[PDB]
Amino acid sequence: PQLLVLFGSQTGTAQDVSERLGREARRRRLGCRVQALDSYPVVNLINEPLVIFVCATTGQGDPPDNMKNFWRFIFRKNLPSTALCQMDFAVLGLGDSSYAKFNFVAKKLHRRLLQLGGSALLPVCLGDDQHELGPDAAVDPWLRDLWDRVLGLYPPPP
Numbered sequence: 001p002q003l004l005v006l007f008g009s010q011t012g013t014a015q016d017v018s019e020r021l022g023r024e025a026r027r028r029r030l031g032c033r034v035q036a037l038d039s040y041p042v043v044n045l046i047n048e049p050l051v052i053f054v055c056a057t058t059g060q061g062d063p064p065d066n067m068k069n070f071w072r073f074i075f076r077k078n079l080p081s082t083a084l085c086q087m088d089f090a091v092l093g094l095g096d097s098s099y100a101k102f103n104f105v106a107k108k109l110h111r112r113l114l115q116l117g118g119s120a121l122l123p124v125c126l127g128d129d130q131h132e133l134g135p136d137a138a139v140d141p142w143l144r145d146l147w148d149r150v151l152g153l154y155p156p157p158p
């Protein structure tokens with residue numbers, strides 16, 4: 001048992017958060033791969049049982065450069081609604097409440113993965129630079145919730 005963490009990051013925050021998830025996976029003795037969305041072979045997703053998507057929202061509500069090819073792929077009109085039936089996922093958004101399109105990338109991605117038959121483990125995380133503590137205000141409790149759900153998927157020895 002294994003976790004895949006895929007990110008879309010323009011200025012490094014969503015990547016750093018993904019690096020943190022990798023550290024937290026290691027502490028929980030779970031195998032973990034961390035990779036940018038445009039570099040992961042997206043066809044392999046219909047085979048992944050557990051994927052966290054960590055996605056920033058950039059200028060004008062657009063996806064970061066390193067998830068653009070992924071975005072084009074995942075929103076293909078005729079992908080079967082059944083494509084991701086084997087997948088448990090969660091989407092961790094990084095954004096800023098100042099903007100009109102607050103965490104639009106993560107919100108849209110969550111909805112799309114549901115459309116493709118994925119099972120969400122958690123609501124989308126609304127990481128928000130506007131918070132006094134930055135995105136960690138939303139990320140910390142969300143990650144706590146995620147690990148509780150993940151250890152439901154992958155129980156201890158007894």
Ligand SMILES: Cc1cc2nc3c(=O)[nH]c(=O)nc-3n(C[C@H](O)[C@H](O)[C@H](O)COP(=O)(O)O)c2cc1C
Nearest residue numbers: 009010011012013014056058059061095096102103
């Ligand atoms: C030029 C620029 C445009 C941004 N536009 C948005 C936006 O439209 N919506 C939003 O929620 N956040 C927006 N943000 C906030 C970022 O999503 C936030 O800083 C995030 O933590 C950056 O993650 P990254 O470093 O992984 O790209 C913007 C930030 C910058 C610097």
